[PDB]
Structure formats: structure tokens, C-alpha cells
Amino acid sequence: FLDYGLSEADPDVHAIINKEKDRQFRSLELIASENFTSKAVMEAVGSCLTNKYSEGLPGKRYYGGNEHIDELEILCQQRALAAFHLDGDKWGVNVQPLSGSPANFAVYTAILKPHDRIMGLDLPHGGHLSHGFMTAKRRVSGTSIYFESMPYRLDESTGVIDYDMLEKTAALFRPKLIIAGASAYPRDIDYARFRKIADSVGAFLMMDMAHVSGLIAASVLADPFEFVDIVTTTTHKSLRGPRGGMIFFKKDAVHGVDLESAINNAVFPGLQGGPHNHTIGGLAVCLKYAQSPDFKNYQNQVVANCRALANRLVEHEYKLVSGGSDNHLVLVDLRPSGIDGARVEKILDMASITLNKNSVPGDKSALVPGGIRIGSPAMTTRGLGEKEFELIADLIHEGVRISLEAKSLVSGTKVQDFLNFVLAPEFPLGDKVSNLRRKVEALATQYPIPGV
Amino acid sequence: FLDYGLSEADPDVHAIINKEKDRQFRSLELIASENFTSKAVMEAVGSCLTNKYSEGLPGKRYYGGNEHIDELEILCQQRALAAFHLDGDKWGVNVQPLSGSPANFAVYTAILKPHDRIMGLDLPHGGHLSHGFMTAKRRVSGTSIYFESMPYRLDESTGVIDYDMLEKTAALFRPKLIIAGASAYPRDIDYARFRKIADSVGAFLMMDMAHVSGLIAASVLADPFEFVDIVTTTTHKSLRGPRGGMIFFKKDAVHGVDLESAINNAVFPGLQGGPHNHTIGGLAVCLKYAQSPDFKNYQNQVVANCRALANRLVEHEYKLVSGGSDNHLVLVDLRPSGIDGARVEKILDMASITLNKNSVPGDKSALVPGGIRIGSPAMTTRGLGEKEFELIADLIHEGVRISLEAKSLVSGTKVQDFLNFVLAPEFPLGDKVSNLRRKVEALATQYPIPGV
Amino acid sequence: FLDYGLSEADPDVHAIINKEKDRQFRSLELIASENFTSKAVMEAVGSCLTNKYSEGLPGKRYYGGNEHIDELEILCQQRALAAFHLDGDKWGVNVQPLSGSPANFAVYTAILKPHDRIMGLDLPHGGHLSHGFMTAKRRVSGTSIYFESMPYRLDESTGVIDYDMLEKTAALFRPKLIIAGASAYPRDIDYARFRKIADSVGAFLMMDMAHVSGLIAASVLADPFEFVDIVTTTTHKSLRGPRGGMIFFKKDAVHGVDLESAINNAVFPGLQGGPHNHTIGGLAVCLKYAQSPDFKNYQNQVVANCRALANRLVEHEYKLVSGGSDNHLVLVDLRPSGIDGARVEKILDMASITLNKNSVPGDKSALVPGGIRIGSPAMTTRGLGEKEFELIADLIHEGVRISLEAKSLVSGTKVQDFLNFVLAPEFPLGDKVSNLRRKVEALATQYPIPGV
Amino acid sequence: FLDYGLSEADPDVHAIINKEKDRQFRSLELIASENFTSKAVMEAVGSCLTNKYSEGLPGKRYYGGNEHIDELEILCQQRALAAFHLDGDKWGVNVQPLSGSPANFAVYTAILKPHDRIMGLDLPHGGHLSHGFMTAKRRVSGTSIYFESMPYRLDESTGVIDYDMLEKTAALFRPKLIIAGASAYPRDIDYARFRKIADSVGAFLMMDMAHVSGLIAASVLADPFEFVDIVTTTTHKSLRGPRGGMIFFKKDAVHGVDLESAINNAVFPGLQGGPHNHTIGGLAVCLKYAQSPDFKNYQNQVVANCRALANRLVEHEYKLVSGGSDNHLVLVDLRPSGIDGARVEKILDMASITLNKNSVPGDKSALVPGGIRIGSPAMTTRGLGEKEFELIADLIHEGVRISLEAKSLVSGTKVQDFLNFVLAPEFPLGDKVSNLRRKVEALATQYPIPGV
């Protein structure tokens, strides 16, 4: 019998994990969908819970030996409801979805028939692929393959959801399901208006709270559970848990449908097999923490840090999509600054500032993203405050200046020409990038980081 | 800053995990889809890899900061190919699927249009729900909602796939995709015959090797890659890795279709979002082990142990479906013994023997399965040999005798009647169950268990 | 062998036809979709052409004996092209559709896949039901069952197609097909604007000219063939042919599609069997006449007569949707007059004036149509001129006044209670209706009626 | 205005009808689906009923109105029920379908959802295309586009429907609708066995009696109304009416569905616009005649004539599919004679014998049909008896002999080369064809032909 540790069993994987750990510690991790989960969550996820098959629901399993798995799943469900301040007679929860996308697809499967109509926020306006996405030449999202999705849009001149136009187009298109929630929407959502619009056409109403779940849990943002029928979420991002998903649903019939029975059946036996109990373990851990005063303080700090960063970017004369943010993220419209997000993302990454390019309202080309998305959750977890997020803004500004300089110096007009130029060993702004990286890492490495 | 460990942060979850670890340790785990993953796999799965967003493929991501994630995913893909002895110019692999069910649904999304025709082994005859399942009342599986599935069946008198009838029904139904592979099939599959049948109608041909992947990697069973276009698998079960999935595909065009592009696009952006890099890390670890001489020895012992158990059960005059097994599992037809699998499963579980009820070909009641499925992988991993599996058969036989005695003594005629009776504190065979449990636990606890 | 004439073979059917001759002679037929076909058409329709099976296309049939049927179909195609002034190198035609709805469904089948998206004018705004129609809880049109339809609407303040809103909703919905044409639209269509909008989303563009085909043939209205890809039509309404349909199509590839082969294959073998050669014979007859100067004079009289009626109704203080008409019909909004179209239709019918109740923009419910649709083609065929159409307006006005008086005598608010009151044998406005009927019949019986 | 007769209005169309009348008079019309309708039917179809409006789109249901009452339609319905010996409390009928194929499609639309499963007799084994047909390359029938069709087949050794295999394949495929009836099946149908099989999967059961309706009305063949839920038919073929269709249905709920409401709504407004009252007029006329003793004698003569022909063809050493016929047609397997149906059909057409090439069970390709379909109804209508049908068999045999001689003179295998050879002005078997044609026409012209 041999059961070596990772350093003994697999030096290459061990080494790679160590490099990634090294990278996380010294980088400014500004991806709005990333966080740093706890040592406790990691210990539950890296446990023997992975070994068990438990298809079905607690007390209602296909296989034997599930006494402790059932205790865990019941505990996890109770903590999910408690974290979002829900009465268990009004709301149920399924904690088995493997991720945010499968959670959404299970909802669609539960309440819609194939080719039924869905409306969600348009992808280039801050939406998520799983709410539907079609190009001129293909159905890109599985949502747009199996269902008939039509987007609603921001007023491109403002960067806020055009509720009046949604009202008009919903009346014409007659969706069965309207989805609120977004991947890159910097403002809070008018949930009352979504309800009015859904009722106008007898639609189901869902909130995908993946990006804002912890802010909702901490009552920093408005509560979608006051207005919607169904709520989906990832358990990573805002909630700072393991990689997984959850679906919350009203237990009272909605449009004559028992959502509990429909959603549970869609998850299993509909779409998934055995639950990932190791993940469910981690989720229960994170949901306990979600109820704590420290988590509430953390989420308020998230929004204060994003505000500090936004204000300083604006002082450097950047334009923000929608003019600001009410949440954990900001979208910088780089077009007025004379550059795009693809170019800026690469230079910033080379200096250990990690974020992503993001499309901006008005972008001519989907293949050239006009902006960058920046989030505060991950570095807020590490204990950075408002002053440090102002420094982050200055470091970003320095990075964008380097990117602008690199753009002018590259002869080629194409994004790929920019990439070849910056990655070449004769790249002439290497020392400016190193100087920036030195400052970035000098900030990041002053702070602890959670994990095993 | 506070980053307590699990015992400190969440005593309730910590205690549950300890109880589950110990239950696994003192039980005979005979669920054919269960195994005990390694310490090294758990270490990778419980690492900081969980923190990274990396939508896309290596070298082509939608976020910064992916240097090390890309190294890991490339390593994982190259190990997957090596474990199955595949030339990378002819075979590709996607290691992102979240589990076996999403792996399969991604394949269907890649190569089929909604409502295209699929044939898989019937669920009551050892098939998996993800290959399609409909009752008289409804479409149960997502596969049967979004696609048009029609089963192929065993010859009910032999328990072997009725290849002649599949030939005839494929010619009539004209499936776009034929699926080989099963959850509870005790024999090797005639892949050459599947290729003949697929070609007769121009169908794509897939193998779902979830239950047999390790046996294939070790060359104990026949290689499906000699005959099929696409192979899907869970990474847990036979491969003894983390909970996840993989899809392998030919890189030469099949029926005019670029499978690489189709399958990769179906996984992302089609159906999933960010890959679970912690799982991918664990997968890379298990795929290294899968190539080792010890893994080959293990897989040969799995088959030898199943054979030792089967033969001893036959000495106790149990009937096996198909007359035996070529693999890691056996199906006991309990009907001639005068009992069903639902009843036997529960008593065995009370005695710390975990297996599952299973439908037998010819079962009249879908609700009341006539058999049990027993697998050797998990206890083989702990180091049990043929003598010990012979003792397992005796203990099972002892449990079935208790179950028969229990079935006789309960007045109630339904399964739920049997359950209430066996769980009553005045249950008259409790001492027989406890005595059996002592013997079971006295055997199990002689062997170590892997994991952290 | 006996082959009696109808009067001997079937006295009851002969009697029914004689009654119908009487009804046609005595009545003012103002149903905008009705007309009177010629004796010559009727003699072709009532011939031995009905005996022949001729599946396929001329010179390419699946039945022998089709030399003369081939002759006829080619002649019919030649005449259809000449009647609409079309270059046969640029346009083809299929003359086999059995009616307008199946003609439209054949087009959809040819160029779309099931559940592809279609936009047509909303039924309650005077659209054709076969362009798509769904209520709050059912898909009523087959078009809306098999395809995904979303309407476009009139500007309610002008009664004209809201082209600006169509431009916006098309961009969001992304129809594969946009349909122009209407059952109750009193204006010509901006084909250039439809082309612009279609091109903005890469849609096919079709005109359904069923109601206006003769006006188009006579160059009274704009030519859709200057801008659209596909034109469908009935043969009975405006062309004064037999009951049937035709589909015209570009012969140059449109969006990579050979419309000729696609359309021909959808008609047969896709949706229909053997062509109705008696109908095709009658159609050929009417298409000869459609080229004549007298047909052109007739179509100009149609519009002049509608103008005369429209102007006199406005003198009687009726509101017309869109303030008038460019074509053969008026849509009268009766809401300001204090009564609905269902009550008025019935009273007018009792007085031998046949027309249709019709929804009007701004109506709350389809159950209470606010208007009546009135058309000049049928009575223009009989020889009525502008002065006689002014007299018709006066007669309609008398009928509306009787309806208002009747309404005041009915206790209920339900349309059924009105119907019961006005049909009751002692209905106290019987003398008024009788007096109006005498005026109506005294106008009608001054004019002959074509036919055998 | 003018109202010229056809000879004056359109001498070209008049000349074509003159030619077709002569062709019908001079030829042996042996197409099994053809017949000669009566003068009385033609007089009704060629009447002012074409200008009658009964109902039109959008229809009374749209406005929430009552059932439309029409004297001619009611008469037609009463006569249809009477002709088939049906109790009107148990059966209803819709007489509005425009032909057989749209009648069938309306049934599917009424009782099925898109992509629901249908089984019908395979096209190459004598099925009808509207029951479903797909090649390896494409969905040819609209039925197979909008629904999921799977065929059932004949036992190729007997030429009879393989009821045992249908039982098996229905249990696997689980159709929602099973269709009985055929275009080229020479035997009666075991309706009791279809009912048994339909009930085994909870399927609706329909009979398409288009080819055999008159034999059913006359009690020559078994009554499908004893067993099925729905019966469709053409009105032209066996009933000898105008070109049209009908749908009969049970009035008691079937599988919880009100068939009356469903079917009526699918026909109109679902799939068609207003009824064709001229056709309904002709239908009423033929349904009166269908109740007469003379019609019953006629239908018995149809069977006797087919038997005389069949027996004489066997004397000439032709093989008949199924070894004979119970009905109005025979399917001759020409493979033992060394020639295909396409070549034979052509030569026979040249000698004024009109019939159809037809696939034979066991043919390798649909591109080379192995047989010919020959029917007695049309020439039976003209007054031919058994002796004359024996002469017809002799004349067919002469034409087959000519075809074989022609085949030997042609260089190569391509049917086009055969066609060019036989149509060449100096075709060297022209005198043999002319001598046969003279015999054919000398027989045909002894008999009158019905019609105006």
C-alpha cells in the first residue's frame, strides 16, 4: 500500500501548484469573478467526501451508506436559506448544481420546454453567455440552442438597463422567462420594475446573483428575493466559497407550477448524476461564514474599495461605463483614452495586475473589446482598504500609459501584432513593465492570503 | 485576518467529515461506481487552484494570470492521451467537463442538433440516464428532452446486448449517434459490431467508458479507441481520480465534422463557464498513476476479485445476470432466491455492507428491482484479495438470508413496509444484523484506506 | 352507364346552388377578400382536368399520361410571369399551391428550419393569421406552432406600419424571414424600407400580395418584385381566378439558397400530393385576362370606388383607420360611433350587405372588434361606379343607425344577447331592416353577375 | 363587361382541355389512384359556389364566436357519415381539407406536438409519403420535418405487413400515433392487431383510407371505423369525387383529448383559410352516390376486375407482390422478367396504357423501381368487366415484351439513354408500339366516359 503526498507522487503537479500559489500571493488579482477561498473550505473540498455516490436528495437516495452525506446536505441547505434570510416554508434550495451555468440550465429545463422564450441582458452590455447568446452566424450559448433567447439592452448612451424598451419588447416577444442579473453590470437592478414587466406577460422571473450574492447576503445591495421566483448563483465569486452552484425557488406554486419538484427533478435525474459532496462540504463551510458579522464588514469594504478605486481612475480621466458603480466592480471604457481592453489586459498581466478585457456599449467590433472590468473582492479578502485601492488605480493608470506607449510603437495595426511585439524578447518597454511589476508585487506581498 | 482550519472554523462540518471518513474505513464499500481516491489527488483538489478563472483553452483564454493553469491543463491533456495510448495527432481530449453527465451532454451538443436521434442501452438493462430515458408518462433524462432517444436492449433470456436486434432497429430508426457503454453491464462490449452497425446508417459512434476506463487503460478489457469516434468518461469510478469528466475525440474529420472544434466549443462557450482547475490538478495526478505498473496490477486484481466473489456467490446458489462478469462488477439476480434488491440493499447497509439495488432483465415492476450490483474496485484499492472477496460473498449471503427472513416476517407487502419494519427499535433480527456488522467491520478495519 | 346532370343526380345540391345564385344576385358583397370569377374560369374548373394525377413538375412527373397537363402548367407559369411583368431569367413561379395559407407554409418549409424566426404584421393590426398568431395561451396559427413568430405593429396614432419600431425589434429578434402584406391594411407598403430592415439582419424578405395582387398586376400599387425575394398570393380575391395559390421566387441564389429547388421541393413532395389541374386550368384563364387593358381599367375603378365610399363615410362622420386608403378596402373604426363591428356586421348581413367585423388598433380585446372592413372589388366586377359606392356608404350608415337603436333595446352587454334579440322572429326593428334591405337589393339587382 | 365562354375567352386552354378529354377517352387509365368523376360532380365544382364565402380568416374562434352553420357543409357531413355507416353520436367529420396530404397534416397538428413520434408503412413498401419519409440525405416529407417518423415494413417473403416486427419496434420507439393505410398495398389491414399494438404504447391510431375508401363504404373490405380513432381520406380516388379530403374522428375523448375540437381548429384557422365551397358541393354529390346500390355493385366489380387481371398476369408468368390482391390494385414484381418499372411504364405510356412504376420489397435502390402498380377503378367506372381486364393483362404483357426488346437495343444502363432511344423519331420498335396502341385504343373507345 502506497499513498504518497503530492511532492512525492507527482513533482510536476506539485511544482505547478506552488507556482500558482506564488503567483496569487504576489499579484493584484482584480478579476471581478475571482476570490480567495478559505483554508476551511479547501480542507472540506480536499476530503474523503469525494468518494461517495449519493444520487437523489437527503432521505431519498438511490444508494446506501448516505447517513453522513445526508446530514451534510441538509445542513448546507439550512445554511443557504439562513445566509439569504429566507423562511424555509416560503423558499427551498438545491445545493447540488455543479456550477453557475449548470444551475441556470437546470432552471430552464425545470420550467421551460425546448424552444420556449427567454430574455436576458445582452452579452456585450454586461450579460452572461448562459442567459443566451447568438451571433449573426451561430447559436453560441447552449441556452440559445435549446431555447429561444432575445436580449434586452442598456441604453448605450447611458450604460443603464433600458427598462422602458424591455417593457415594450417583452410585450411583443412574450418571453416565458425573464432573467435579471449580470456578469459586468456595475449598478443595482430595479427588481420591482422586472416584476412589473414579467407580470405584464405572465413570465417567470429569475435573478442570477452569481456576481453579487455576498453583497445581497450582507444586505449591501437590494434583495432580489423580495420580487423574483427563482434565484441562481455560483458559490465561488462574491460568496467566497468552493466552485459550485445553487438554485433557490419559491415553494408556493408559481403560474401553477410546483417549482421545488420541477427544479429538483431537473437537477437529478434530469441533468446531473451524483452530487459532488466534497463541494457541498465546502459550500456548507462558506455559508456558515456568510452569516457572520465579519462577512458583513467584508462586503461593505468591498463596495467602499471599488468606490475608492473608481474615484481615482476618474481622477486619472478614465471613463467608466454607467459613470460609476454601486457594487464590487467597475467597467472602464478605454476608447476615450485611445486604446482597447485586449491590449491593456496583456500589459497589465505582464506587470502582475490581473483583470479582463470586457466589451463596452457602442463597441464596433466584438473581436476588439473596448474596456476592462475591475473587481475588489479578491484583494479586499486579503485586507486591502481604500488607500491601497487608490494605489491600485495609480498602478493601473501606469499600466495603461505603458500600453498606450506600446500601441504607438507597434507598427502592425492588429491585436495579434501587439501581442507578438509585447511578448518578443526584444520588447523595448520591458523595463517599464518590470518597474511597474516591482511596485505591484511590493503592495500585494504586504498582505496575507487565505488557504491551506 | 483570520484563516482558521476546518476543525476551528466549523466543528459541525469537521465532525461530519470525520464520521464519514470513519464510516468508509469500517464498511465494505461494494458500490461499483465508488472508489477511494489518493492523498495526492485530494491535495491537488483541496488547493489554491480553485481560485482561478480560466475560461477558454490553453494559450487562448478570456482572463489574465493563466500561465500556470495553462501548464497544468496541457500536462493533464497529454497525460490523458498517454494513459489511453493515443497518438496526439489522431486523438484530442477536453479535460474540462464537470462530470460524466455534462461530458455526454457536451458531446450531443457538439455533433447533434436538437431532436436528433440517439440510441443507448436501456436504463432498466444497465444503461445510464444520460444516454436517454423516457417513461410512458415523461421524458426523465435531459437527453430525452433535447434529443430523440430510443433504447437498445439486452436479450432478456441471456442478459447480453441483443446485437442482432440493434442492427435491425438502427436501420429503421436511423440514429445520428449510437452510444456504447453502461452503468451496470457485466460483459465486454463488441466494439467492432457497434462500428458495423453505426456505419450501416452513417451514425457517429461513442463509447461511455465511465465504469471501465481503468480496465481499458490497463489493457484488461478491449480498447474502444480502436473502433469509436468519441469516448467520454467520469474521472472518478474506475480511473480512481477526482469527480470530473473527460471527452476524447478523433482529430480526422468524421462524417465531414471537425470534432475537436465542435466538442471544445460545446464545452465552452456552449455549456460550461470557468474550468475547475483544482479538479483538473487532481485529474493530472490520477492520470500519471494510471500509466504505472502498479495501476495495471491493481486493475488485474479488480477483475480477479470480482471473479472470486462471483464464484463464491454461485456456490451459495445465486444466479448472476449473463452468467458472470468480464469486469469489475457482478449483477446478482435475486428473484430465484425469492427476494429483490431494494430489500437486500437496506439490510446489507445496516450491516455496513454498501452496494445498490439494480434492475434485472425481465423485472415486471420498475419500482421493485430484482437484483443487486456489486463491484470490487473500492475494496481492491484497500488491498483485499481473492480470499477476502470470498469472505465478502459469505457475508453478503448471510445478509441475504437475514433479508429473506426479514421479508418473510414483515406483514406489509411494499418496500416501505419492509423499511419501517427493519428500522423499528423492536426489529426482531437486530441481533443478527449486529452480529453480521461485527464480522463485516472486523474484516474492513484490517486494511488501510487512502486519502488525506 | 348513367351520367345524369346535377338537377337529376342531386336535386338537393342543385337547389342549394340555385339559392346561392339568388343570394349573390341580391346582395351587396363588400367582403374585401371576395370577388366574382368568370364563366370561362368556372368552365375550366368544372372540366375533366380534375381526373389526372400529376405529382412532380412538368417533364418530370411520377405518373404517365401527363403530356397535356404538362402543357397547361407551363402555360400557367408563363402567364403568371407575364401578368406581373417579370423576367423569366430572374423570376420563377410555382402554380401548384392549393390556397394562400399552404403557399405561405411551403415557403417557410423551403427556406426555414423548424422554430426559425419570422416577423409579420400583427393580426389585430390587420395582418394575415398565416404570418403567425399566438394568444396569451395558445399558438393558433400553424405558422406559430412550427416557427417562432413575433409581430410588428402599426403606429396607433397614424394607422401606418411603425417602420421605426420594426427596425429596432428586427435588430433584437433577428428574424430569418420578414413578411410584408396584410388582410386589412389600407395603405401601400414601403418595400424599400422593408428591404433595408431585412438586410440589417440578413433576413429573407417576402411579400404576401393575396389581397392586392390585381392592383399590383395593373400597376395601381407599388411593385413588390422590385425589392422582395419571394411573393405569395391567392388566386381568387384580387385576380378573380379560381380558389388557389402561387409562389414567385428569385432564380438567383439568395443568402446562398436556390429558392427554385427549395420552394418546388417543399410544395411537392414536401407538403402536397398531386396538383389540382382543374384549378390550374382556371388560373391560366384568369392570368390571360389579367394582362388585358380591361383588367387594368377594372383595377383603377376598384380604387376609385373605394375612394368614393371612403369619402362619403367621412361625410357621415365615420373614422377610418389611417384616415383613408390607397387600395381596395377601408377599415372603419366604429368606436367613436358607440358600437362594435360584431353588432354592425350582423345587422348589415340581415339587410343583404355582407362585410366583416375587424379588429382596430387600440381595441382592448379581439372578442369585441371595434371596426368593420369594407372592400370594393366584388361590386366593381358587377359594374358599380363611384356614385353607386356613395350610395353604398349611405346604406352602411343607415345600417349602423339601426344597430345603435337595436343595441339600446338589448338588456345584456354580451354580444350573444344582441344576436338573440335581432334574430328573434318579432325583433321590433324588423321593418327598418326590411326597408334597408329593399334599398340594398334594389341597387344590387340592377347589375348582372358573371359565371355559368 | 363581357362574360365569354371558355372557347372564346381562352382558345388555348380550351384546346388543351379538348386534347385531355381525347387522351382520357382513348387510353387505358390504369393508375390505381385515378378515377373518372361524374358530370354532376363537375357541374357542382364548376358553379357559382366558387364565389360563395361561408367562413374566412381569422374565423369565429378568434372573435369568441359560435360554430359556423352552413347548409351545404352540414349536408356533406351527414352524407359522409351515412356513406360509411357511422352513428353521428360517436363519429364526426371535417370536410374542409383541401387534399389528402393536408388532411393528414391537420390530424398531426391536432393531436401531436412538433417532433412527436409517428409510425407509418415504409414508402418503398407501399406507404404514402405524407406518413413520413426520410432518405439518408434528407427529410423529404413535411411530416418527417415537423414530426419524428419511423417506418414499419412488410415481411419481404410474404409481401404482408410484418405485424410481429411492428409490435416489437413500436414498443421501443413508443410512437404517439400509428398510421395504417397505404398507396400500394394489395391486401386488407388487420385493424384489430393495429389496435392491440397501439394500445400497447398508448398511441393514437389512424387509418388513411384514400386508396380504398369506396371499398370500405361498400363493405367489400373490413371497416377501420370498428377499431381506429381517426380516419382520413382523399375524395377523388376510390370515392370518385372532386379533389379534396376529409377527416373522420371519434366524438368520445381519446387519451383525454377532444378530437373534434382539436381537428377542427387545426384545419381552420390552424392550417387553411376559408373552405372551398365548390369542392364541398361536388363532395356532397359524390357522397350521395356512394350510398347507392349501384356504387356497391361498382366497388364489387372493381375487385373482380383486379382479380381477373391479376390471374391473367400470373398466366403470363408475372410475379405479384403478396401473390395477388384483396383490393383494386396489383403490384407486379418485374425483376424475374429482367426489366424495371421505369422502362416498362414509359413504353406502356407510349401505347396509351397509363400506370406507375413502383418500388417492390427487396429492391436495392429507389432510383430503379422493380415493379409496376396497376389499378382497376378508373376503367371499371367506364364499364369494363372481367373479360376486358383479361385483355388488359394481355396488352400489358405485349408492352413488357416490347420494353425488353427495346432494352437490348440501348447502349448502357442509364434510364435517360433508354428514354432518348424510345422517343427518337425513328425508334425501330415504333411499329410494334403503334400496333399495341391501336389495340389499346380499340378497347378503350368502346366505352363511354363520364363528365361534362
Distance from CA of D295 to the nearest CA of C (A): 12
- Taking only residues 327 to 356 of chain D, the set having a beta carbon closer than 8 angstroms to any beta carbon of chain C reads 345-346, 348-349, 354-356
Contact list in C for residue D242 (CB cut-off 8 A) is: 50
Bridge partner residues of C231 (DSSP): C207, C248
d(CA A216, CA A189): 12
In angstroms, the Cα distances linking B13 to A45, A287, B48, C156, D150 are: 11, 11, 20, 63, 54
- Amino acid identity of residue C176, one-letter, is K
d(CA A44, CA A278): 6
Measured N-to-C along each axis, helices D277-290 and D293-315 cross at an angle, to the nearest 10 degrees, of 80
Boundaries of domain holding D127? 72-290
Contact list in C for residue D17 (CB cut-off 8 A) is: 44, 47-49, 281
Contact list in C for residue A167 (CB cut-off 8 A) is: none
D204-208 β-sheet, strand order: D91-94, D245-250, D230-234, D204-208, D177-180, D117-121, D148-152
D17 contacts D344 by C-beta, under 8 angstroms = no
Show which subunits contact A, needing at least 3 CB pairs below 8 angstroms.
B, C
- Amino acid identity of residue C148, one-letter, is E
Q: Pairing mode, if any, of strands B319-320 and B356-358?
A: unpaired
**Catalytic residue check, D243:** yes
Contact list in B for residue D136 (CB cut-off 8 A) is: 174, 201-202
Q: How was this structure determined?
A: X-ray
Q: Would the CB atoms of D42 and C42 count as touching at under 8 Å?
A: no
A181 contacts B181 by C-beta, under 8 angstroms = no
Give helix then strand counts, H and E, for chain A: 17, 17
Residue closest to D376 by CA, chosen among D298, D319, D267:
D298
A114: domain CATH number is: 3.40.640.10
What's the resolution in A? 1.7
Any D CB within 8 A of B151 CB: yes
D168 contacts C296 by C-beta, under 8 angstroms = no
Q: What is the 3-state secondary structure (H, E, C) of D198-223?
A: HHHHCCEEEEECCCCHHHHHCCCCCC
Best mutation site among C1, C16, C29, C51 for testing chain D: the one with the most D CBs within 10 Å?
Answer: C51
D9 contacts C289 by C-beta, under 8 angstroms = yes
Cell of B295: 495501476
Q: Would the CB atoms of D133 and C39 count as touching at under 8 Å?
A: no
d(CA B19, CA B17): 5
Q: What is the 3-state secondary structure (H, E, C) of chain D?
A: CCCCCHHHHCHHHHHHHHHHHHHHHHCEECCCCCCCCCHHHHHHHCCHHHHCCCCCCCCCCCCCCCCCCCHHHHHHHHHHHHHCCCCCCCEEEECCCCCHHHHHHHHHHHHCCCCCEEEEECHHHCCCHHHCCECCCCECCHHHHHCEEEEECEECCCCEECHHHHHHHHHHHCCCEEEECCCCCCCCCCHHHHHHHHHHHCCEEEEECCCCHHHHHCCCCCCHHHCCCEEEEECCCCCCCCCCEEEEEECCCECCECHHHHHHHHHHHHHCCCCCHHHHHHHHHHHHHHCCHHHHHHHHHHHHHHHHHHHHHHHCCCEEHHHCCCCCEEEEECHHHCCCHHHHHHHHHHCCEECEEECCCCCCCCCCCCEEEEECHHHHHHCCCHHHHHHHHHHHHHHHHHHHHHHHHCCCCCHHHHHHHHHCCCCCCHHHHHHHHHHHHHHHCCCCCCCC
d(CA A227, CA A209): 13
Residue closest to A411 by CA, chosen among A430, A424, A396:
A424
Contacts 24+ apart (CB under 8 A), D313-321: D313/D393, D313/D396, D313/D397, D315/D393, D316/D393, D316/D394, D316/D397, D318/D397, D320/D186, D321/D159, D321/D186, D321/D360, D321/D361, D321/D371
Give helix then strand counts, H and E, for chain B: 17, 17
Distance from CA of A50 to the nearest CA of B (A): 7
d(CA B201, CA B166): 12
d(CA D451, CA D44): 12
d(CA D118, CA D148): 6
Q: Which of C13, C123, C451 faces D51 most closely, judged by CB atoms?
A: C451
**Catalytic residue check, D70:** no
**Catalytic residue check, A55:** yes
Q: Provide CB contacts within 8 A for A327, sequence distance 6+.
A: A186, A187, A188, A211, A212, A215, A221, A303, A306
Choosing from A26, A43, A53, A116, which is the catalytic residue?
A53
Bridge partner residues of A330 (DSSP): A374
C47 contacts D46 by C-beta, under 8 angstroms = yes
**Catalytic residue check, A298:** no
SS3 assignment, position B77: helix
Any B CB within 8 A of D138 CB: no
Q: Would the CB atoms of C369 and D63 count as touching at under 8 Å?
A: yes
Q: Would the CB atoms of C174 and A134 count as touching at under 8 Å?
A: yes
Q: Which of B115, B168, B201 faces D115 most closely, judged by CB atoms?
A: B115
DSSP letter at C266? I
Contact list in A for residue B50 (CB cut-off 8 A) is: 37, 42, 45, 236, 242-243
Q: Provide CB contacts within 8 A for B22, sequence distance 6+.
A: none
Q: Which of B16, B43, B102 faces A5 most closely, judged by CB atoms?
A: B43
Distance from CA of A176 to the nearest CA of C (A): 11
Residue closest to C59 by CA, chosen among C77, C47, C36, C42:
C77
Bridge partner residues of D333 (DSSP): D319, D371
Q: Which of A115, A151, A173 faces C150 most closely, judged by CB atoms?
A: A173
Q: Which residues of B are catalytic?
A: 53, 55, 208, 234, 237, 243
Q: Which of B134, B169, B172 faces D174 most closely, judged by CB atoms?
A: B134
Cell of B13: 462540518
A425 contacts A5 by C-beta, under 8 angstroms = no
- Angle, vertex CA D65, rays to CA D61 and CA D67, nearest 5: 80
DSSP secondary structure letters along B203-228: -EEEEE-TTTHHHHHTTSS--GGGT-
Bridge partner residues of A177 (DSSP): A118, A204
Chain center to CA of D369:
19
**Catalytic residue check, A208:** yes
